[PDB]
C-alpha cells in the first residue's frame, strides 16, 4: 500500500481543513490508515458473496467520505445497501456536492 503519511501530507495541505474552523472545529483528518482499507476490501467481497445486506455510516461534514461513497455506489450495486442509508448517502451527495 501507499505510505499513509504521504497521503496525509497532501490531503491535509490541499484540503486545508484547519483554516476552516468554526472556531473549535478541530478538522484534522480522520481514518485514512491501513487495516481499514483491507477491512473494507474483505467486507465488500464477503457481503456480495454471502448476500449480506450492509449499511452505510458516515458524517456529512467529511465530504471526502461522500466523494468516496459515490465510487462505492458506482462499482458496488445498490440493492446490496439498505434503502434508508443508500438514500441518505445519495442525498448528502446531492445537497452538498452536486446541486
Amino acid at each position: 500500500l501507499v505510505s499513509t503519511e504521504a497521503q496525509i501530507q497532501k490531503m491535509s495541505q490541499d484540503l486545508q481543513l484547519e483554516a476552516l474552523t468554526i472556531q473549535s472545529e478541530t478538522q484534522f483528518l480522520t481514518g485514512i490508515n491501513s487495516q481499514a482499507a483491507n477491512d473494507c476490501f474483505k467486507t465488500l467481497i464477503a457481503a456480495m458473496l454471502s448476500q449480506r445486506t450492509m449499511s452505510l455510516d458516515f458524517v456529512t461534514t467529511n465530504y471526502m467520505s461522500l466523494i468516496s461513497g459515490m465510487w462505492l455506489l458506482t462499482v458496488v450495486p445498490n440493492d446490496m445497501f439498505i434503502r434508508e442509508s443508500l438514500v441518505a448517502c445519495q442525498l448528502a451527495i446531492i445537497n452538498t456536492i452536486i446541486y
Partner: protein, 49 residues
C-alpha cells in the same frame, strides 16, 4: 480524479476476486433484505480509494 488508474485497478481486482470466489459456491446465492445489517464506515472506503 487523479487516482484514476489506481481505482480502475482496484475495481478490476475486486471483481476478479469476487468471481473467483463465486465459483467456489454450491448453494443458490439469493438476494434478501435481512433483519440486521453489516456496518460500513466510509472512512474505510476513503482509506482504500
Amino acid at each position: 480524479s487523479n487516482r484514476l488508474g489506481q481505482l480502475v485497478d482496484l475495481t478490476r481486482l475486486l471483481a476478479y476476486n469476487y468471481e473467483t470466489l463465486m465459483a467456489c459456491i454450491t448453494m443458490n446465492m439469493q438476494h434478501v433484505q435481512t433483519l440486521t445489517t453489516e456496518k460500513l464506515q466510509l472512512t474505510s472506503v476513503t482509506s482504500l480509494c
